[PDB]
Write a protein that binds this DNA or RNA. Sequence first.
DNA 1: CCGACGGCGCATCAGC
DNA 2: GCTGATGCGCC
DNA 3: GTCGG
Length: 326
Amino acid sequence: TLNGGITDMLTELANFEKNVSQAIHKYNAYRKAASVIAKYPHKIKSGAEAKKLPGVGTKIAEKIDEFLATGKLRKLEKIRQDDTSSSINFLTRVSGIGPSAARKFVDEGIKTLEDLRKNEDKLNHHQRIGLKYFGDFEKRIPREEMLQMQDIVLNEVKKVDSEYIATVCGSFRRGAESSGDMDVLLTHPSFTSESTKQPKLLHQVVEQLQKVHFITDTLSKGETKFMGVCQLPSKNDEKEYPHRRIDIRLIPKDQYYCGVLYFTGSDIFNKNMRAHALEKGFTINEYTIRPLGVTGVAGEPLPVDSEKDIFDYIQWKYREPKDRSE
DNA sequence: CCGACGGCGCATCAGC
DNA sequence: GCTGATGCGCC
DNA sequence: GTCGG
Ligand SMILES: [Cl-]
Ligand SMILES: [Cl-]
Ligand SMILES: [Mg+2]
Ligand code: NA
Ligand code: NA
Ligand code: NA
Ligand code: NA
């Protein structure tokens, strides 16, 4: 990657603002700048060159000049040395432990993997499973395994009810050669924006995937969103595959295109696209796109018959999934 | 300057 | 119990 | 931290 050094720096700064400073807008600012620099097709020669990009301002330009001059950032060098900042950053790598919980644990003298392991009773359920699979969850998933996972999910879903449609979204749908997890959008004709003609639609699917030992653990579960753990089966004599995070989202069927736009991401692409929507006078969520009235109040859902329709509303040329990895 | 910055599901908790 | 705030997660 | 009015 042309500007990998700079983008890593900015990502590290973002993480610090989120995890330690608890400054979500600074976090988003750094990530937006990292993303715009990541897609910039030249090797950046100066902060001023970078500043020409949307999302890079005066402060980041200065840091980019320092980084180009020396290969590092004193601000980060110092952060890397702060024990409290270090501990907090580490703890937040456990799924279910955020900035608040991490600072709280550190207060109690819980700040290593070893500490966490002996204090399981101090963890909620989500955290306990995040700890259980700490190592596994930091591994990426080769697209080849994603394909095997897709096959299992789609086929098990079909076995429950042939009218279910399951679509793998996330980085997979954007064509990534590896993914951090598996994202599954689910629809069923019994669940629309107008009616829920069937209960347990998500449950039945989760239950079936548990029955075949694909889903192994649950982080959280409700009527429309499942957040859990899954695992590919391994052959005789061979090492097991790592455990993987899986997210399943049941979306009203008539709202599939807004749903699939959302779940395809990336996260930054979504933020960017939704902010542009706001500027164009619309608001987009995973269900609908709606006009903003004069007062600045969301109007009624606009008709959408394709992903492209959404892009049209906000006056963007269509972008294929593979070009949304921001 | 300075308000806005994407939008929302599930878990947990305070207050009634 | 409920509702509203907040934490944490997803893209 | 950056943007736009
Ligand atoms: Cl902030
Ligand atoms: Cl809506
Ligand atoms: Mg994903
Ligand atoms: Na800029
Ligand atoms: Na975490
Ligand atoms: Na996910
Ligand atoms: Na803005």
